[PDB]
Amino acid sequence: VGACVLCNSQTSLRCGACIRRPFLCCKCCYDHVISTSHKLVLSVNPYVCNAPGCDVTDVTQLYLGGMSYYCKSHKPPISFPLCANGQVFGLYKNTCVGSDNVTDFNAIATCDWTNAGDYILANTCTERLKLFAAETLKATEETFKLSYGIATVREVLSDRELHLSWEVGKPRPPLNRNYVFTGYRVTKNSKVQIGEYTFEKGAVVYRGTTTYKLNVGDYFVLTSHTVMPLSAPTLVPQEHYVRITGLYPTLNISDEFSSNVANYQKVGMQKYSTLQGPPGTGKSHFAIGLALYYPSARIVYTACSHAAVDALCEKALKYLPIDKCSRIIPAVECFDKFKVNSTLEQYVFCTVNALPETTADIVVFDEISMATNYDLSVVNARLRAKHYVYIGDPAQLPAPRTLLTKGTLEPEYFNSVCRLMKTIGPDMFLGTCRRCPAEIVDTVSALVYDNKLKAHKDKSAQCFKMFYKGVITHDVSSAINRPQIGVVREFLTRNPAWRKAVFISPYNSQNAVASKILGLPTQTVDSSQGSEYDYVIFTQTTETAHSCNVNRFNVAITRAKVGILCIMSDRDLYDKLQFTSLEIP
Ligand SMILES: [Zn+2]
Ligand SMILES: [Zn+2]
Ligand SMILES: [Zn+2]
């Protein structure tokens, strides 16, 4: 028994072809089964033919005869169908509303999640359907990881480099840091974990969670995790207050957090508040500063990534009493300077999926562009708070959608929070970039921030751009542009001070080639997010949807504190770079 996800109607049915098996009421179950290929139905039992060796599962060909279900062929003389009068048969057969359209829920139930439209619907549908869609998606994502062939260690060529043997009659996943493996050692009568791993074309380079002497027969699978059902909405119902509520502001603050006093008050005068923090505008500074402005306030800081929760801890470590902080960790090496897994501690720092059920004065969720509606619901499910602050930047990178291939995913469709920030704007905006040279700030202010992002620093006169298409080669799942790396090699010989630069590209393969030919440290734009470097060398590599995504370009060029060389493929972003142009040697 449960709740129709369209009617909320109390029902004893679930769609057996829907991977999540939503509860559907008589009405909605019918309206679902007669309008889609979804025809298995589950009650306190499965609507299947209890006759011996008949495969009839379809609910539109089944009859309740006695207290056992049967198809046309097997049914007893006295039987009624299971599926007639616009209602499939089950408990609570009287209480059952329906819907003017079931269209959206059918699409969510039956889409494969390859098309943009699927993610758009999941972010414009009713809130109950936002939850259903978020589960359906995450479970579809986790199942697709199983369709991947097992990789097995054939040969250990070196230390940090392997030969992989791959399960036949299955595809192999891409080898970039968006595919994280778990290893396993072969045992008597089962297997045990040996850490998480990542791979890259070599033979294969492997970067593992722990160190080992892993030997032949050790094998690797993308570990999938059981997706829980979602209860809580992605956003609580909003409220606006006329005073600050349940928070007691400090009387003496420091001139370090004084630019945020207005904003911290706003946080106290509404139930939740959206903060857009462009690159190096001070999001974490803002987030810790909030504590000092409400010193009695209990504050759970949360984010999707260990990395993001840890950067909050690093900042906390410099301003908040250590004894009054705790890092929640489930039984990967994360921040270890606060008492571990102490929930009743004033300042709790914890990833979303490891959050305890607990209350707080304020909840600070960071790097929000990386949150899915799934994570939103979980936070609301685990944390009841007087005040929720969602810090992030919808002009930065979302969570990867591995299944997505047809269309691009717009920032207004990353999650419920980013939808709000792109449609009604954010509650607050950190408008001054402390990190980048003026040229980079000017460029992205115009590009993605409506010309409201101002440069704290001057022009560096150290930002350059070159238009060089060069030559694009493709390996299995990545791009390489050797002539763009050539141009960078030639620039470095003439500009040797740039040897302190990081190499960023939108492809880990370009990165690998660059590493061998330049010996610059490398990041993918995605791997670079929330990191700063004095000098950055960016090769666009291709003119793809991927390499020209304005949010990826935004993150790419905002990693520089002092100077940047962009070797560009795309005439459009090339022309949008307010940088000194360079001719080709
Ligand atoms: Zn219903
Ligand atoms: Zn279904
Ligand atoms: Zn039968």
Swiss-Prot record:
Binding of Zn(2+) 12, residues: 15, 18, 32, 38
Outcome recorded upon mutating residue 263 to S: In strain: Omicron/BQ.1.1
Compartment annotation: Host endoplasmic reticulum-Golgi intermediate compartment
Catalytic activity: ATP + H2O = ADP + phosphate + H(+)
Repeat region (LRR), residues: 223-243
Known outcome of mutating residue 384 to C: In strain: Omicron/BA.2, Omicron/BA.2.12.1, Omicron/BA.2.75, Omicron/BA.4, Omicron/BA.5, Omicron/BQ.1.1, Omicron/XBB.1.5, Omicron/EG.5.1
Domain (+)RNA virus helicase C-terminal: 431-585
Outcome recorded upon mutating residue 360 to V: In strain: Theta/P.3
Residue ranges occupied by any (+)RNA virus helicase ATP-binding domain in the UniProt entry: 252-430
Sites where the protein binds Zn(2+) 11: 4, 7, 25, 28
Effect of residue 411 to S: In strain: Mu/B.1.621
Effect annotated for changing residue 87 to H: In strain: Iota/B.1.526
Source taxon at top rank: Viruses
Stated consequence of mutating residue 421 to I: In strain: Kappa/B.1.617.1
Binding site for Zn(2+) 13: 49, 54, 71, 74
Domain CV ZBD: 1-112
Binding-site list for a ribonucleoside 5'-triphosphate: 277-284
Function: Plays a role in viral RNA synthesis. Multi-functional protein with a zinc-binding domain in N-terminus displaying RNA and DNA duplex-unwinding activities with 5' to 3' polarity. Activity of helicase is dependent on magnesium. Binds to host TBK1 and inhibits TBK1 phosphorylation; the interaction with TBK1 decreases IRF3 phosphorylation, which leads to reduced IFN-beta production.
Assembly notes: Interacts with nsp8 to form the replication-transcription complex (RTC): nsp12, nsp7, two subunits of nsp8, and up to two subunits of nsp13. Interacts with host TBK1; this interaction inhibits TBK1 phosphorylation and decreases by 75% IRF3 phosphorylation, which leads to reduced IFN-beta production.
Record-given protein name: Helicase nsp13
Lineage, broadest ranks: Viruses, Riboviria, Orthornavirae, Pisuviricota, Pisoniviricetes
Gene field: rep
